[PDB]
From a paper:
Each protein forms key interactions to promote cell infection, with the terminal domain of the fiber, the fiber knob protein, interacting with the viruses’ primary cell entry receptor. Our findings demonstrate a conserved binding site for sialic acid, common across the species D adenoviruses, therefore suggesting that, along with CAR, the receptor can be used to initiate cell entry.
This resulted in four structures of HAdV-D25, D29, D30 and D53 in complex with sialic acid also shown in Fig. 1. The short soak allowed only two of four trimers in the asymmetric unit to bind β-sialic acid, with a significant change in packing, explaining the sensitivity of these crystals to soaking. HAdV-D53 is of particular interest due to the recent confirmation of EKC causing infection, similar to previously identified sialic acid binding viruses HAdV-D37 and D64. In contrast, viruses pseudotyped with the fiber-knob protein of HAdV-D26 demonstrated a statistically significant reduction in transduction in all cell lines following cleavage of sialic acid. This was also demonstrated by viruses pseudotyped with an HAdV-D53 fiber knob protein, where all reductions in transduction were also statistically significant in all three cell lines tested. There was an overall trend in reduction, although in BT-20 cells there was a small, non-significant, increase in transduction of HAdV-D29 fiber-knob protein virus following treatment with neuraminidase. These results indicate significant usage of sialic acid by HAdV-D53 fiber-knob proteins, and the potential partial usage across the other species D adenovirus fiber-knob proteins.
Author numbering:
A (entry chain C): 179 to 366
B (entry chain A): 182 to 366
C (entry chain B): 178 to 366
The structure:
């Protein structure tokens, strides 16, 4: 009706949907829009609770990054082992989601020939990585690196991994980010 | 082409930074369902921002171009960009008639809320990028894009241009930057 | 084939060399152009598999700081044989491969000539025909290379995409194989 099977997303709310350190400590806002052979991806992160909400590298000098993993089965269905919760990961309907959990999203999965699964004896190429920067609090001198890797997780058919890292000593800085856009080659 | 809202890609000035028609903002918004793919560049053709000289004007380090939209996604006259230049694509030009509705191109208000007393302002309504004056690799300028942070409108796209180098007799005409944002509908 | 995808012009996502930087088939340029109406969404990476740019050593070659890959197109948007990119696997998509026949027209994928004019002797050259990006050798965050993409600035063709790769660090025995970068450009039609 208003079902939008060309967008797979978290809904644009600020309600937590993600575990970095503890259940529901963060909102990963992730929008995957299918433009044929490419997925246009838009991502940001708000940490609402737990250890990563406020970075203080004076008190926690070793706290310099964390990972959010989306693991997908052979149908492109988000697995329970993901950091991202399944509840509100679905095809778009307006500002919400389709009324039923999707069964197939292979059109949204990172291409396995572009981005092969890890295997001994085959060369691992960097083209399964996209680097970006996002900025804590929108401040131009609070960069964090967002490294996105496709299909490098085990125990799944497809994966998107977000590795967040910083090299600056952030003192009482709320971990809530600007947005970044990237694309990747779709499986079909 | 009602999937593209743009300024035709010619060099004819369409924008007021400092004075009438001092610049060409080339802005292309392509609707890929729930996301708008945006491509932007700027040519300053006249007035105070045409040639940057930070020897003469050491405090001249940025400026803003605002697109303000009403509840129908129609560009408001208070915008820096002229309304007569902003329309759905027709070939290398624009539709001959004013659009009535472009809510599908507006930045999503739940993703990017209007400024409100008492409520948390999140940075996800910002995208940072760099563009390069004259295409020169050592003439970066920051283009900060903010969604729905202007007052007196339903929706907004704001381009804040800034630089942290002393540019001497540098023409303010930029490389292109691509970003996306979540659409209202 | 009703699996022909004339909204994707690409190299295929495989690792088979398709590009000459220094010598025949020394690299795989993975380039995917997806038509979203008036804009082409472009995704690019480079693997150098052989020849002088496979392993950078700026101790042995201190002046070696860049190279160029040119795609030159005729009036129909057909890739010219003189390009760095090889013609045989540059085609509209069919699944993970290409349409069975070489395309005759791809003007919808060409960089817009009003946005990005050809070089002319008397004419003001605007920088908006350039996009800058970074990619990272071996996926390592401290091995950046600049990828500068320029539209329609080559002579002897109707359209062009030029990739200028450069770096500003001393890379010692670093394999030139990159992360991916996404950009867009305004389409001719």
């Amino acid at each position: 009706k208003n079902n939008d099977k060309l967008t797979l997303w978290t809904t644009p709310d600020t309600s937590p949907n993600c575990r970095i350190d503890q259940d529901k400590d963060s909102k990963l806002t992730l929008v995957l829009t299918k433009c044929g052979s490419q997925i246009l991806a838009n991502v940001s992160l708000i940490v609402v609770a737990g250890r990563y909400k406020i970075i203080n590298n004076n008190t926690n000098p070793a706290l310099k990054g964390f990972t959010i993993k989306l693991l997908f089965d052979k149908n492109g269905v988000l697995m329970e082992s993901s950091n991202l919760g399944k509840s509100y990961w679905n095809f778009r309907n307006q500002n919400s989601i389709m009324s039923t959990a999707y069964e197939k999203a292979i059109g949204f999965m990172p291409n396995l020939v572009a981005y092969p699964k890890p295997t001994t004896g085959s060369k691992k190429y960097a083209r399964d990585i996209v680097y970006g920067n996002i900025y804590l609090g929108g401040k131009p001198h609070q960069p964090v690196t967002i490294k996105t890797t496709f299909n490098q997780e085990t125990g799944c058919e497809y994966s998107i991994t977000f590795d967040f890292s910083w090299a600056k000593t952030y003192v009482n800085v709320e971990f809530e980010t600007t947005s970044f856009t990237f694309s990747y080659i779709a499986q079909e």
